[PDB]
Design a protein around this ligand. Structure first.
Ligand code: HH2
Ligand code: K
Ligand code: K
Ligand code: MN
Ligand code: MN
Ligand code: MN
Lengths: 248, 251
């Protein structure tokens, strides 16, 4: 019933990572998204693995931002819960098998096809739904697949503005939607100037509120506390609204 | 047009000017100055004490490039302020405390915020009682000479209402917005935001849930928000206005 808060942990110390994870859990993170990725599968594993081994025992879900089944599989043997795939299984078809094999969840982020024929929304829907079908025919449950519009990838300024004005249509596919705009160019431009990254937390929080109201079920963010608490408030307001209107 | 940010200035004079400057920098469109409260159980003061507290501050900030609103329910304090060039009179009694208010406000061509207050022992639903009351007062503000597009309605979250009644109102902000008078939401760090937190915090820690009420309220159509943390809310309001314009522009 509650909006999930996926915290961002970029791994580009294991000790500092661990301390940061507890700090994030503390600020309200439901999922800790670890990511460290052109480098070698081996190099990617050299950065991501030591962290995953240290934090996977904690009482929080661990997502791993990777697009290669080899990185996803070593992580899943350690007990990881989600594979946040920026390519939506396009980069390595074997991602679907690795995930099915460990009864995990997977995020399918819209990416590629930058010079698309069709308008961005029809294309994103077509591609993402096509990837969802592949996930399932691999044996991954329907309810373990998330869709991500992929703000910041293979889309022009105009295309993303279109995508952000029609989030309801992605939500309408009934798959749980993860919004991930945090501190991106799109948020930089909401501010209207060349802001530094951190300066983008408040507009990012705006996307969270707006997205939750459009039906997004999770938000991927750098500033956990701000979004965790802004989301709590918005969730509260919608529920209160349903209650007082006897809407369900 | 954007959502206006009315910063709260609770009332020495230099200390106040400092805080007004900062609020302007954080994005404040209006600075709302008050020295009184209409909460039963709170200190009551004289018109004269309100003046000593309020007038020297208004005098020193009315020149700035920001609108000034004065939170008062007595027209003598109002006029004293309108004579210094103040732009808005924020009335916790919607002109029911002092019946000369609308005439004073319209005399200096100002704006007025009519806040829902009183009759906490009503037996009809809060919402229809508030609408009936606020619209009757508004109708009276126009008779006196205040144009409709300068009469604001405020649901008075935190005044003469039960937790049950505040939740009723927050779930139906659009009905107030539907009246077509510009709407000001003022929930900052109040008890309602404390329920949202679901626990006890110092006032400052209620800022994020206050900001959620801002995002939500803008979605519902309110035109301004009265807040303590101007920056968090000004920056948030800005993102929401953009998301909303973008969505309307694209449809
Ligand atoms: N128009 C309007 N004016 C108001 N003035 C004072 C308070 C609450 O007063 P207090 O409890 O003293 O706190 P603060 O002055 O910080 O808001 N609330 C409103 C309000 O909801 N709407
Ligand atoms: K875990
Ligand atoms: K001024
Ligand atoms: Mn639409
Ligand atoms: Mn006050
Ligand atoms: Mn309704």
């Amino acid at each position: 019933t509650k909006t999930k808060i996926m915290g961002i942990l970029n791994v580009t110390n294991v000790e500092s990572a661990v301390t940061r994870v507890k700090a994030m859990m503390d600020e309200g993170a439901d999922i800790i998204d670890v990511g460290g990725v052109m480098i070698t599968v081996e190099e990617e594993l050299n950065r991501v693995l030591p962290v995953v081994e240290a934090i996977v025992g904690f009482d929080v879900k661990i997502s791993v931002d990777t697009f290669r089944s080899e990185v996803a599989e070593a992580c899943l043997k350690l007990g990881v819960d989600i594979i946040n795939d920026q390519w939506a299984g396009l980069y390595d078809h074997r991602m679907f098998q690795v995930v099915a094999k460990y009864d995990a969840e997977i995020v399918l982020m819209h990416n590629g096809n930058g010079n698309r024929d069709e308008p961005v929304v029809e294309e994103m829907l077509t591609s993402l739904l096509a990837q969802a079908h592949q996930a399932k025919i691999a044996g991954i449950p329907s309810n373990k697949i998330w869709l991500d519009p992929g703000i910041g990838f293979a889309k022009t300024r105009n295309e993303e503005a279109e995508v952000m004005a029609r989030l309801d249509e992605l939500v309408a596919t009934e798959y749980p939607v993860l919004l991930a705009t945090s501190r991106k160019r799109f948020t930089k431009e909401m501010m209207g100037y060349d802001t530094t990254p951190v300066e983008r937390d408040e507009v990012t929080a705006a996307t969270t509120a707006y997205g939750i109201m459009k039906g997004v079920r999770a938000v991927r963010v750098h500033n956990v506390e701000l979004n965790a608490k802004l989301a709590k408030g918005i969730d509260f307001l919608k529920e209160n609204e349903n209650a007082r209107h006897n809407f369900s």
